[PDB]
Amino acid sequence: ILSRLDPPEAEVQIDRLITGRLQSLQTYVTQQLIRAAEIRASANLAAT
Amino acid sequence: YADSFVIRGNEVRQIAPGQTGNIADYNYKLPDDFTGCVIAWNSNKLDSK
């Protein structure tokens, strides 16, 4: 993008990539917290 | 800050962020992140003879 385009425009398009990739990464983290609770619930049962 | 100079009409387009040419490369370059104004008017009556 930045190499062939125009810096003022490259910045807006790179920000779209940052936002889309950040949303993917945040989705990953939310699902790890939801799955971590399931493993902890199982580990509490196994300890009991 | 008030910067003033004289160029050909053809080159007023270079007085703007992210342009190239003799003026913007070698004489008066505005930064990519520019937050001001450009005012330009024709002065044939004053600066040509």
Chain B nearest-CA distance from A9, in A, is 11
- As a residue count, chain B comes to 49
Q: Does A7 touch chain B (CB under 8 A)?
A: yes
DSSP B21: S
B12: number of Cβ within 10 Å: 14
Q: How was this structure determined?
A: cryo-EM
Q: Does B32 touch chain A (CB under 8 A)?
A: yes
Work out the widest C-alpha separation in chain B, in whole angstroms.
38
Q: Does A6 touch chain B (CB under 8 A)?
A: yes
Burial (CB count within 10 angstroms: exposed 0-12, middle 13-18, buried 19+), residue A42:
exposed
Contact B7, B15 (CB under 8 A): yes
Contact B38, B15 (CB under 8 A): yes
